[PDB]
Symmetry: D2
Subunit: 285 residues, 4 copies
Amino acid sequence: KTTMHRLIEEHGSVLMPGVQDALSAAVVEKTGFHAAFVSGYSVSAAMLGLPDFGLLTTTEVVEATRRITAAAPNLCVVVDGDTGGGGPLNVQRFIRELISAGAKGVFLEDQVWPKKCGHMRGKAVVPAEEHALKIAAAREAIGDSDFFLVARTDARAPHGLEEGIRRANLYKEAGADATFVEAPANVDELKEVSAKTKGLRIANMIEGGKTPLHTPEEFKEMGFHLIAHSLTAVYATARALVNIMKILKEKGTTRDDLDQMATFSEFNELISLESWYEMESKFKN
Amino acid sequence: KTTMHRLIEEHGSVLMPGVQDALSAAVVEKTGFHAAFVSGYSVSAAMLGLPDFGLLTTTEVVEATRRITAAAPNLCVVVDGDTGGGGPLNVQRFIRELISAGAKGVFLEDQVWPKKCGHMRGKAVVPAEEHALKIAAAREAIGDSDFFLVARTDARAPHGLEEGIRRANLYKEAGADATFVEAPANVDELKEVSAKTKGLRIANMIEGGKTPLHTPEEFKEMGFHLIAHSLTAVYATARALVNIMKILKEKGTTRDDLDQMATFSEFNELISLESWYEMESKFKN
Amino acid sequence: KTTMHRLIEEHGSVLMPGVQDALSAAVVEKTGFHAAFVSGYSVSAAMLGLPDFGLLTTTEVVEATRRITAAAPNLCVVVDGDTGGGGPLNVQRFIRELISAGAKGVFLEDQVWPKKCGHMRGKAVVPAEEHALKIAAAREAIGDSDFFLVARTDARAPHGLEEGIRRANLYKEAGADATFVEAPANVDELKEVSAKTKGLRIANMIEGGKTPLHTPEEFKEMGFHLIAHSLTAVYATARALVNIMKILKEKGTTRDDLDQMATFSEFNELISLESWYEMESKFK
Amino acid sequence: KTTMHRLIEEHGSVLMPGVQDALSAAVVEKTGFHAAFVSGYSVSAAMLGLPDFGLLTTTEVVEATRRITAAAPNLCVVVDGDTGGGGPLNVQRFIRELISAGAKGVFLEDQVWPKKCGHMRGKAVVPAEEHALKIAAAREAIGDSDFFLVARTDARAPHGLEEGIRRANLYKEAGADATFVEAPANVDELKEVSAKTKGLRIANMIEGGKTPLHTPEEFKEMGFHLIAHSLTAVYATARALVNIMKILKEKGTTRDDLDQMATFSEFNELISLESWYEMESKFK
Ligand SMILES: [Mg+2]
Ligand SMILES: [Mg+2]
Ligand SMILES: [Mg+2]
Ligand SMILES: [Mg+2]
């Protein structure tokens, strides 16, 4: 059916770096990866300068998705759908719009709106049944479309692995392609997720988050098929930005320390300047 | 009149890091800077994954400007206006829109549309008079609005410092607040720009570009008042992204090398997570 | 001392036609009105072709706002905010955004999300305190901004006029500038709202609606200050398009029905083709 | 074998009403037409309240397109591309964007930037080869895409019908699917374009325009295949808004002129309030 399906087949567990925009999406594709995750958290920070505090609207992740699609046309793009922007009807519209934005899948959550990062302090969740219907709602919207449907549960934090899990299996029944139990606290937890969730499983790596950091081979072992590395891109970026700007402020110059930036061979290699010069010429007289 | 004016007074030459979005704009403000430059080149790469090859529309830099404004409300934001999006009438509309997008100034160019980076291989320029009118056009649109009007000339590349310069003085007559002679090849050139251009002068530092890299004290000396450091932010970003993603691809994990990313103390310190938690609480019962 | 407060004083009942894009805002401003309301209902239809089902997002409403505002830069423009996009924080990003988008007011509503129209079949409502807090939040985010705040309650249908009224009064105390009890069913019910809600009051005229149709001069008498005429524009528009496109479809041309469309001088009068040609020549 | 090529074959002259947003696209589709044209003129007015002065950007036209497309997902939608946003590269980003936005064709024009309308006072034109190349570029960017390409020439006013014609033929050879000589002044001039331009031909009906008003069945006879009826919608609309808002302003209410606005079942018929209520109940 799906590119995720044909992707989780061809490989063991698929590593899907988190992306916050076109340049990052570009770098991800260029580095060989076959999938990428439009991260709400990242998009919030990068696009709006906002904490993952449920301020980012469904409309905005769509705009960002459209750009990221265009910029990395090959990358199999999966989008952070948060709450899914309302009730069933909102979800469906949102789904339809992401299919038009060129994406190939969603994550949708358990949380009360407005939501927070799954590794953040004070989350709450709607009754399972209520979200089940939304999965069901997205399911119908997707139809034949090439669209992977990940149902996420933030239930562990306030209710423990038990709750989180049963919700996972319920969303699977509802018609999800795969399941995502957010923020397992350790290995044991992870492995326990793997034993009592029916079908394909996600797992989200967050540097300094609440889960142990593992590899596609290690996850294949534990039985997780899609690995979102959500904040790698943004987190790297933020350091680099703070570093270079400090250097800039106190010297007033990059002049001395240029090993922090990139080359033009490289930057333009990155974006294919030469490649364009070529197209441009095909069309003068 | 302007915040640039009152800024170029309070300081000698103002260092204005180039910005490509909210997160970067945020980091710039947070690091003490008093000004920032919405770079078309950066916005192209970051927002669209596109080379500075004149594909970015006036409408898009406006959207980006609006976000960057909101995200760094204090930063005195100056926008890369490229060609200015058409003829006089387009410029005016564009100007009006940037004033609404919360910005405080523009750079507008000499180039034939579609334009290219000022440090790029094959640029062309419209007759001086033609651009003079556009400066004049923006001038009237600005009125009392708090808006700094930098007129840029890309004439050096294809016609030499002479042409570039006379164009500079002409755009000054036309009503520009300050003047920008793009891509002086060396010090001598710079200093020559400073001797025969009447009034306030810009200077653009591009890492590995065609100009020598200098500091606000050094520029104050040479007589340049506004220093755009256009590609620092984006260039740092691109390295960091390529680095981390390579590491990610070949290990499948950041686990070992976490000194490349940022902390949560730090990331959230960056965006003020705690600060939000505080506002959020003011309003529960 | 907000612009609207000013308008409600210079006049007695401000009449505020609904508007759903740039052209309609223009026509509205060109017609002599001083205030205009961005209708979420209208906008779903005009801008997205969607029933008023709480699909139109807060992002969408703002874009919509921006254009309306630029095109009709004098109209005191007031935005239907529906639910406010979620919690008090979402409300606050939204007020900020709207202020940035050139508006001077919002209406914020009682309803569960996703909201429905105000004269539509199924409506539920969040606990009054919850909205009182959103209002409050709104208020703080408004600060000095010239931005008239309207608290709407949709409680009348599910709960009777009493609730509608206490909630209005509750929301006034939480710092709205004016209060809107949706869908009084008739004159008595208006007068009752007028008698029992303290402060500035909104009425909302919708043709075919549950509330009876009345004029400013009359409303002035019934103690109402801000009359939304929300769906008129979209409604006139919709009929116009349906008629013409029938003709165009059946007769294959407009040839015989030209008096349906507007005039060159007329149209240009609405969008100023002479104001432009001039500015254009000034800079040739 | 593009959708439009299909439409021009199933029928003889395709009649393609102009449309400037979601509601109008809807009405147009709901009325039985199979094709619709996104009018840049219309859109400047409706969406931004701007004279057709080449202010509407390529970005703007696309957003506009997307909405129109979703709301009217069967209408074979064809976009007024004006100048194409600049050089051949800009043309190409634009074709891509439009294909992504769900369209099935564009019209690309001869004019210097910034363009004006096609029946407006001052018009100049770029060297034919320059546009031929843009067309070509367009063509390549189109590839397999179901996307009917129209090359428009505005040379008739500044240069006479001869230039208009050679340029059309020039642009056909550069790989447009159809050709549009703007503003033949009358029947003779149409027939002359019909006789001297090779391939598929566009005519563009504008009420008050320079070209005389004719029907598909007639145009079929004069050898034209795609008739834009570009400004009708906006024009009907504009009159509708001006009348109503006069009434609303003078009488203070719509109370006495209700037959100007549309019906609840009617309106909802255009935007499907029953289709929704149903999907809604399916998931409660
Ligand atoms: Mg998220
Ligand atoms: Mg630039
Ligand atoms: Mg509403
Ligand atoms: Mg046009």
